[PDB]
C-alpha cells in the first residue's frame, strides 16, 4: 500500500514518538507524515508572544536548537490553545492563529478572526540540503511563501542598488563596505519575517548570477560568434582591441584577466557586441563597477553614468524583456579611473512571474531552519515585535541628535580643536567632533596610543572639547598590527584570524604593515577588545566610539571564497556558518563593556556594518565609503529607508559622500590658490548643499569624507548660497530639537522608527508603495530631497490625507496628488501633515545649551493629532528607572481644541514651569515657520490646560 499506509503516527500520556504531534510548555512539534526527499521531518511552532511565533524545521529527527545570536529571552509566558482537527494543527494566541499541516509541514498565519496574513508555498516551501564545512555539519535551506500581487516588502538592511519595494526582486545578503545585510523583511500586509541565519543568504532568486557566456550567445563588434569585443584606449600609447569571453573583472583574481600591458588609469574601455538569449522573458542583470561606467542595451541607456572610486566597487541592477533567438546590441563604456579597477556584467535567466513574485529565502548554512513571524496592527507594531524579539533600542544620548562634524582625517590636535572652535566662533551649532584613523604612531595600529608629535596631550584635547560643550568620538578598528602587544595578546589565546598573517598581507600605510583582525565571536576575545579600549581611551574621557571595517573588511575586493578564509574559523563554527554577524558581536563587546564599567553613562557606537539585533547595543550604522555622486545621494534615501524598516532606528551617512572625484579635488586646490570657482567646484558646492539638506532629516546628522575639507566654511564662504543654506538647516536641526529628541525617546518607549518610508504612515494609499525618494522624519514632516545637479524643482507625490502644508510658507497642498514643486538651490521641499503638533525651541549652540523654557507649539490644523513632548537628563540611563517626563498633547479638529496634558514624571534639572506659544496653521491661514509667530501664550506648570482655537 501507500508509504502513508505502511508508516504513520497517531493514549494521552504515551511516548511522543507514537504521536503525530507533541505539545510542550510553549511549543508544538509536528512530525511530517508524508516525508519528501529534501523536505522537513519535524516542524515546530513555538509561541514567543501574543503576536510572535517562532517556526523551526529540520530534516533530522531532533532539533539542534543552538543559542540564537539575535533573539533575546522574552518578558513573560504567553497563553495559547492548540486544536488538532484532522490534518490541521492550529496554535492560537489572543491575536494570531498559526497552523501547520501534518501531511506536508506547511504553515500559515491568520488573525484572530481567521483572515489570512501569510501562507507558506502551497504543498510546502521548505527544502534542506546537507552542507559540511571544516568538519561541521548543517543545511542549506530554502523557505518560500505565497505572496499576493499587491504585497510590498521593505528591509533586508542597507543596499546600494537604489531598490525600493522588494516585491519580485532579488538581493544577496552578505556584508561589504556600503552594503549592510539584515535578514528581516516587513510587509505592507502588517507582518514581519526574521530569518535566524548568520550565513550568506538570498532574498528572491536562490541562484547566483551567471556570466554572460553561460546564458547568451555572444557576437563581437564584427559579428563573430563566441565573444564580445573589448577596446582599450590608454591615456598614452596604442589602442588594444581583443575578444572577451566574459565581462567579469570583479575581484583581485579576475582583474588579472584584463590586458597585461595596458595601464588603466585614464583609459577608456568599451565592451560591445550583441547578445542572443535562448529563452524569452525578463532577464535580470547586475553590473559591478568602479570608476565611471555607462551601459546601453538594445540602444537604450539602461545604466546612465555611475561612479565609485577605483578601490570601492558597487553593484547596480537592471532588467529587460528579451526574445529567444533575437540578437540585441550591448555596450559598456568604462573609465577605470585607477591602476586597479573593476567592471563586470552578469545575469539571471527569466523566472516565471508566478514564482518570482513569491517571498523566497535562501540560507547557505545553519543547523536547522529558524524564522520568526511577527504580526502587527500596522508597520510600527511589526517593528515593535522585532524590538521585543531582538531587544529595545535605548534612547540615544541627546548630544548624538545634534550635528556631527568629521573628517578623513584631522591630522593633529590643533587641527581638530581649530575646527570645533570654528563652529563656536561662527555661531554654527554643533555637538560632536570626530577623530578618525591614523592618530597612532604609524607602525602601531592597534596600540591605541597617540602619536605625541601630532597629539601632544590627548587628555588636554578631550578636556578642551568638553570645555567647548562638545563630545568626542574616536575611530577604533578590530584590526591590529602583528608587532603590537595587543595583537600578541589575542594571538597567544587563539583569538586572531590567521589567514591575513599566513598570506603576509600588507596594508596601505607607509611601507605597508602586517596585520590581523580578531575573532569577535569569542566571548573572552570581546572582553579583551573592550579592556584594551578601557585601558587606553576611556580614561581620556572619550564619549563615543566609531568602529570601522566591521564587516570584517580584512582585504578589499576579494571573492567570496577568500573572504570566508579571511574571517574564520570562528569560536562558534566556520565563517560559512558565521559570516554576517561580526558587527553585532563587536557592538556587544563595546556596549556591555562600557555599561560594565559605568552602568549609568549612555553608550554611543557607530559601526560600518550591522545585523539583526544591533539596536539593542545603542549602536548605529553608517552607509560607508559611498561616492561624491548624485546617484549615490539618491541611493542613500532608499538605503536608509530599508535600513529603518530592518528595525534599527539610528542610521547615518557621510553627507557629501566619502570618496571624491578627482575633478572635485582639483576644484578645491584651485579655490585655495586663486579663489576662483571652476565648473567642477560649482558642482561640488551644489552637491554638498543638497546633501546637507537631506542629512538634516536623517536620524544622525553628520558630515564626513575624504579631502576636500567638509566644514561648511571650507565648502563656501559666508554669504554664498551654499553656506547660507547649510547654516539654515544646521540651525533648524537645533530649533527642531524638542521634536527630534521626543522621537529619540519614542525609540525606546514606543519601539519607534525615526526615518520612515511613506508606506509606514500611509499603508492604505498604495501609490506610496514604490516611493523611495521621499520620507517622513517622525510623524509630521515629509522630506523630498533634490538629487540632480541644476534642478530647481522636483515631482512630489502627496499621500492621501486631510492635507499638507509647505513648512516654509504655510501654504496648503491637497493630499492624493502628484505635482512639480519648486526647489530653489537653498531649500529642500518640506511639508507638514495636517494634524501635526510640533514643538520648536529657540536657537542654541549645542543640545541643552539652555533650557527649552519657551517652546513654540505649532498646530497644523485640518485633522486630529497627538504628540508627546519627552525630556530627561540626556546623558545617562536614569530614564530606565523612571526619571523622565512626558507632556502629552492632543488636538481635536472637529472642535479646534488643543489639550496640553498633565505632565507625567520628573527628573533632575527638569523645568517645572515653562512657556508655550501655540501657533496655528490652517487652510485659511498660511503661517510661515517663524519663531516670532503670533499665537496664544500658555504659562505651564505641569497641570493640564485646554485651548479652544
Ligand atoms: C574606514 O576608513 C577610514 F578610517 C579611512 O578611510 C574612514 O575615514 C572611513 O570613513 C571608514 O569607512
Ligand atoms: Ni594595552
Account of the 3D structure:
- 19% of the residues lie in helices and 31% in strands.
- The chain is of the alpha+beta class and 949 residues long.
- The chain has five domains: 11-208 and 351-391, glycosyl hydrolase (family 31) (Immunoglobulin-like, Sandwich); 209-350, Jelly Rolls (Sandwich); 392-754, TIM Barrel (Alpha-Beta Barrel); 755-833, Immunoglobulin-like (Sandwich), CATH 2.60.40; 834-949, Golgi alpha-mannosidase II (Immunoglobulin-like, Sandwich).
- The strands form eleven sheets. The chain has an eight-stranded antiparallel β-sheet with strand order 1-2-3-4-30-15-14-12. Strands 39-38-37-36-33-32-31-40 form an eight-stranded parallel β-sheet, with helices on one face.
- The longest helix has 17 residues, at 679-695.
- The radius of gyration is 29 Å and the shape is globular.
Amino acid at each position: 500500500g501507500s508509504s502513508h499506509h505502511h508508516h504513520h503516527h497517531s493514549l494521552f500520556q504515551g511516548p511522543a514518538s507514537n504521536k503525530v504531534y507533541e505539545k510542550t510548555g510553549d511549543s508544538v512539534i509536528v512530525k511530517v507524515q508524508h516525508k519528501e526527499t529534501g523536505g522537513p521531518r519535524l516542524v515546530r511552532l513555538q509561541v514567543m508572544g501574543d503576536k510572535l511565533i517562532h517556526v523551526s524545521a529540520t530534516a533530522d529527527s531532533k532539533f539542534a536548537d543552538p543559542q540564537s545570536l539575535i533573539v533575546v529571552p522574552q518578558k513573560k509566558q504567553t497563553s495559547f490553545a492548540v486544536v488538532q482537527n484532522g490534518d490541521t494543527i492550529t496554535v492560537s494566541t489572543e491575536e494570531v492563529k498559526a497552523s501547520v499541516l501534518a501531511s506536508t509541514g506547511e504553515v500559515w498565519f491568520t488573525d484572530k478572526n481567521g483572515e489570512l496574513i501569510l501562507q507558506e508555498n502551497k504543498g510546502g516551501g521548505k527544502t534542506f540540503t546537507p552542507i559540511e564545512v571544516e568538519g561541521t555539519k548543517g543545511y542549506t535551506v530554502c523557505q518560500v511563501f505565497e505572496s499576493p500581487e499587491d504585497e510590498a516588502f521593505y528591509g533586508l538592511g542597507q543596499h546600494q542598488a537604489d531598490e525600493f519595494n522588494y516585491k519580485g526582486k532579488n538581493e544577496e545578503l552578505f556584508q561589504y563596505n556600503t552594503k549592510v545585510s539584515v535578514p528581516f523583511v516587513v510587509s505592507n500586509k502588517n507582518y514581519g519575517i526574521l530569518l535566524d541565519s548568520y550565513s550568506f543568504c538570498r532574498f528572491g532568486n536562490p541562484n547566483d548570477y551567471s556570466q554572460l557566456n553561460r546564458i547568451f550567445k555572444l557576437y563581437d563588434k564584427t559579428g563573430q560568434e563566441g565573444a564580445l569585443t573589448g577596446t582599450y584606449v590608454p591615456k598614452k600609447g596604442e589602442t588594444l582591441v581583443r575578444r572577451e569571453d566574459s565581462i567579469y573583472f570583479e575581484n583581485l583574481k579576475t582583474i588579472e584577466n584584463l590586458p597585461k600591458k595596458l595601464p588603466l588609469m585614464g583609459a577608456k574601455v568599451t565592451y560591445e557586441g550583441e547578445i542572443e538569449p535562448a529563452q524569452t522573458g525578463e532577464f535580470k542583470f547586475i553590473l559591478y563597477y568602479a570608476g565611471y561606467v555607462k551601459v546601453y542595451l538594445n540602444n537604450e541607456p539602461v545604466v546612465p553614468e555611475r561612479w565609485r572610486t577605483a578601490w570601492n566597487p558597487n553593484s547596480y541592477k537592471f532588467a529587460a524583456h528579451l526574445e529567444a533567438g533575437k540578437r540585441v546590441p550591448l555596450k559598456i563604456e568604462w573609465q577605470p579611473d585607477g591602476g586597479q579597477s573593476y567592471c563586470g556584467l552578469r545575469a539571471l535567466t527569466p523566472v516565471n512571474p508566478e514564482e518570482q513574485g513569491k517571498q523566497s529565502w535562501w540560507s547557505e548554512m545553519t543547523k536547522q531552519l529558524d524564522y520568526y513571524f511577527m504580526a502587527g496592527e500596522n508597520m510600527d507594531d511589526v517593528i515593535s515585535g522585532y524590538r521585543s524579539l531582538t531587544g529595545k533600542s535605548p534612547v540615544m544620548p541627546k548630544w548624538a541628535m545634534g550635528f556631527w562634524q568629521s573628517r578623513e582625517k584631522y591630522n593633529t590636535q590643533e587641527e581638530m580643536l581649530g575646527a570645533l572652535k570654528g563652529f563656536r566662533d561662527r555661531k554654527i551649532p554643533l555637538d560632536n567632533i570626530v577623530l578618525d584613523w591614523n592618530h597612532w604612531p604609524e607602525n602601531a595600529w592597534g596600540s591605541h596610543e597617540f602619536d605625541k608629535a601630532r597629539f601632544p596631550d590627548p587628555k588636554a584635547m578631550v578636556d578642551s572639547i568638553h570645555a567647548m560643550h562638545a563630545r568626542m568620538m574616536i575611530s577604533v578598528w578590530p584590526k591590529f598590527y602583528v608587532t603590537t602587544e595587543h595583537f600578541k595578546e589575542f594571538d597567544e589565546n587563539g583569538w586572531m584570524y590567521q589567514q591575513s598573517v599566513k598570506d603576509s598581507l600588507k596594508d596601505w600605510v607607509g611601507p605597508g604593515y602586517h596585520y590581523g583582525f580578531y575573532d569577535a565571536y569569542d566571548p573572552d576575545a570581546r572582553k579583551l577588545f573592550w579592556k584594551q579600549m578601557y585601558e587606553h581611551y576611556y580614561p581620556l574621557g572619550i564619549d563615543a566610539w566609531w568602529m570601522d571595517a566591521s564587516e570584517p573588511n580584512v582585504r578589499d575586493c576579494t571573492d567570496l571564497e577568500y573572504r570566508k578564509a579571511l574571517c574564520g574559523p570562528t569560536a562558534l563554527g566556520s565563517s560559512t556558518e558565521f559570516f554576517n554577524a561580526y558587527a553585532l558581536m563587536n557592538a556587544e563587546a563595546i556596549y556591555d563593556g562600557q555599561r560594565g564599567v559605568d552602568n549609568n553613562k549612555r553608550v554611543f557606537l557607530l559601526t560600518r556594518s550591522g545585523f539583526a539585533g544591533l539596536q539593542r547595543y545603542s549602536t548605529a550604522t553608517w552607509s560607508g565609503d559611498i561616492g561624491t555622486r548624485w546617484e549615490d545621494m539618491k541611493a542613500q534615501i532608499s538605503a536608509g529607508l530599508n535600513f529603518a524598516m530592518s528595525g534599527i532606528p539610528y542610521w547615518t551617512m557621510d553627507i557629501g559622500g566619502f570618496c571624491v572625484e578627482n575633478r572635485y579635488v582639483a576644484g578645491q586646490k584651485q579655490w585655495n590658490a586663486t579663489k576662483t570657482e571652476n565648473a567642477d567646484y560649482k558642482e561640488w558646492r551644489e552637491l554638498n548643499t543638497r546633501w546637507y539638506q537631506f542629512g538634516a532629516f536623517v536620524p544622525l546628522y553628520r558630515a564626513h569624507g575624504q579631502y576636500p575639507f567638509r566644514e561648511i566654511w571650507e565648502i563656501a564662504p559666508e554669504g554664498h548660497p551654499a553656506y547660507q543654506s547649510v547654516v539654515y538647516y544646521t540651525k533648524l536641526r537645533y530649533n527642531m530639537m524638542p521634536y527630534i529628541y521626543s522621537l529619540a525617546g519614542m525609540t525606546w518607549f514606543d519601539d519607534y522608527t525615526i526615518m520612515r518610508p511613506l508606506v509606514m504612515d500611509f499603508t492604505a494609499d498604495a501609490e506610496v508603495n514604490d516611493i523611495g525618494d521621499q520620507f517622513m522624519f517622525g510623524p509630521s514632516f515629509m522630506v523630498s530631497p533634490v538629487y540632480r545637479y541644476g534642478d530647481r524643482s522636483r515631482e512630489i507625490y502627496f499621500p492621501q490625507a486631510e492635507g499638507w502644508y509647505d513648512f516654509y510658507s504655510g501654504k496648503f497642498q491637497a493630499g492624493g496628488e502628484r505635482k512639480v514643486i519648486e526647489a530653489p538651490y537653498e531649500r529642500i521641499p518640506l511639508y507638514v501633515r495636517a494634524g501635526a503638533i510640533i514643538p520648536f525651541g529657540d536657537d542654541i549652540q549645542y543640545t541643552d545649551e539652555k533650557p527649552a523654557e519657551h517652546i513654540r507649539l505649532y498646530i497644523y490644523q485640518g485633522a486630529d493629532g497627538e504628540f508627546t513632548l519627552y525630556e530627561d537628563e540626556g546623558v545617562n540611563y536614569n530614564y530606565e528607572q523612571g526619571m523622565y517626563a512626558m507632556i502629552p498633547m492632543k488636538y481635536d479638529e472637529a472642535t479646534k481644541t488643543l489639550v496640553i496634558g498633565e505632565r507625567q514624571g520628573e527628573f533632575p534639572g527638569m523645568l517645572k514651569e515653562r512657556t508655550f506659544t501655540v501657533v496655528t496653521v490652517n487652510k485659511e491661514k498660511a503661517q510661515p515657520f517663524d519663531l516670532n509667530a503670533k499665537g496664544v501664550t500658555v504659562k505651564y506648570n505641569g497641570s493640564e490646560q485646554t485651548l479652544k482655537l
